[PDB]
Amino acid sequence: STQYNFIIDASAFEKGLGNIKRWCSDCTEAVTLNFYIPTFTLNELDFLQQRRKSFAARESLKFIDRLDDSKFANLKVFIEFPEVLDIILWSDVMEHNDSSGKINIAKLPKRLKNLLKSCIYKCYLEGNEGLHWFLISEDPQIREMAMQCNIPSCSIVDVDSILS
């Protein structure tokens, strides 16, 4: 039996909602899925739905509500408690940052710093639970900052190849 543990960003939902729904309905006793939805994702999908009139972002938020309300077979979903961001230390993110990396992590906008806090919390800190986590994203800036902080990431196509 295997379990995949994913942290899913907003761009993954906006660009790959149809793919994610298929993973959720095709998972079996042999392959179970375990999702963590950070505060970044909820806030960014709300921004996309309101400010960009994104149909896919609006549908993604409704799908996340369905996931959190209903108990799907072989699927676990956890929505981040926003107060966790005030407990996670920025110094714990900096301890995983490659200092030779070209991105100035300390100068990123607050919403991206908090996405990094959520990822580090799962990959390395109290949110780990003895599991191996991957970040799913369709945003190059996010994948590049995640790689500099040793957070493994995958595109929608990467996951589709691992699950097929």
Numbering used by the authors: 1 to 164
The authors write:
Among these, the nonsense-mediated mRNA decay (NMD) pathway is responsible for the rapid detection and degradation of translated mRNAs harboring premature termination codons (PTCs), which can arise from mutations, transcription, or processing errors as well as alternative or defective splicing events. UPF1 is made of 2 structured domains: a CH-domain known to interact with UPF2 and an ATP-dependent RNA helicase domain (HD). Nmd4 is composed of a PIN domain (for PilT N-terminus) and interacts directly with the helicase domain of Upf1. Nmd4 stimulates Upf1-HD ATPase activity and strengthens Upf1-HD binding to RNA.
We also determined the 1.8 Å resolution crystal structure of the PIN domain of Nmd4 (residues 1 to 167) to help us solve the structure of the Nmd4/Upf1-HD complex. As this structure is virtually identical to the structure of the PIN domain of Nmd4 in the complex (rmsd of 0.5 Å over 163 Cα atoms between the 2 structures), we will only describe the structure of this domain in the Upf1-Nmd4 complex. The Nmd4 protein is composed of 2 domains. First, a PIN domain (residues 1 to 167), which is structurally similar to the PIN domains of Kluyveromyces lactis Nmd4 (KlNmd4; ) and of the human proteins SMG5 and SMG6. As previously observed for KlNmd4, the catalytic residue D1353 of the human SMG6 protein corresponds to a leucine (Leu112) in the S. cerevisiae Nmd4 protein. Since the D1353A mutation completely abolishes the enzymatic activity of SMG6, this strongly suggests that the PIN domain of Nmd4 is not endowed with endonucleolytic activity. This is in line with the lack of evidence for such activity in the yeast NMD pathway, in contrast to what has been shown in metazoans.
